[PDB]
């Protein structure tokens, strides 16, 4: 139940999820040989946590993982169906839409979309 679609890139906007849903995959990129590819948000009946840790060289949901030694750009997540992110306007001023609610994953008759 993973969203095979990337969130829409809106001009003058930054998209971030507050809480990541159980099943989310964050790839670990910067290099990091030994092992450790991505991090899985998963846990038992009572808890939620990110499974692995990532090195580098050259409530029902998980909380955003703390930045590691080398990580570029906005993180390339792999979200799950039903995950919701929020857009924020930084220095670009437009707020004709009062109540902010967009970007959710839905299974539209077989294919995932934002």
């Amino acid at each position: 139940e993973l969203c095979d679609d990337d969130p829409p890139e809106i001009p003058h906007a930054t998209f971030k999820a507050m809480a990541y849903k159980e099943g989310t995959m964050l790839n670990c990129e910067c290099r990091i040989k030994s092992g450790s590819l991505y991090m899985l948000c998963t846990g038992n009946s009572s808890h939620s946590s990110w499974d692995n840790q990532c090195q580098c060289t050259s409530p029902g949901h998980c909380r955003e993982p703390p930045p590691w030694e080398n990580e570029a750009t906005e993180r390339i997540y792999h979200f799950v169906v039903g995950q919701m992110v929020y857009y924020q306007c930084v220095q670009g001023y437009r707020a004709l839409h009062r109540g902010p609610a967009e970007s959710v994953c839905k299974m539209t008759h077989g294919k995932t979309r934002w």
Partner: antibody
Amino acid sequence: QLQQSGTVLARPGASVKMSCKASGYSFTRYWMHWIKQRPGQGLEWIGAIYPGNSDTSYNQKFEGKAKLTAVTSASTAYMELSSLTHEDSAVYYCSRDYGYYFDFWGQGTTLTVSS
Amino acid sequence: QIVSTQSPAIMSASPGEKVTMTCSASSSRSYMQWYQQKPGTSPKRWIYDTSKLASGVPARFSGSGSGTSYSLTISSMEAEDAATYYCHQRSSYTFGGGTKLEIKR
């Protein structure tokens, strides 16, 4: 979903390239794993590849034996296998990684290496 | 590098018997997965995150363990269960040696 190439034959010292054609999902967004299984014995992890940026990772046993590549435009993952010996005669599986577990596997490719 | 070891290699069970098979880590792990395989087919997901059954896995199967010691358990053995079970972990992606489960008669 996951269609691998047919049975291969090879001689000792040769190389071989097998394929694994993905279909019905975004080839770019998933890790692709390769797994060896010698006749009778168990499963061995060969390595993985992210076809989005070709970031590969290998089991230490196969560093210089296996080479993992992908062609995004074909939706096909490849594995080349060098200086083949008798101990490479096995069944090779490609599988998609669902994080929790490997959720889909190919039917496998039987490599036989002999003179 | 993390290395899995399974005991036993081969075991027999009469229909109805409780069956238990063990997998132990060389270094601490968070979760343990199990896969099932029958001759002529691919391994199939069976148990993930230590105790969580995959879709279609019978209720007879349960998963247990933590730290460096884990186990798969069948409460009541049925003919359909004869297989090899491989333990597996998502830290370094190594497999156990597998436990082959057969029918005692």
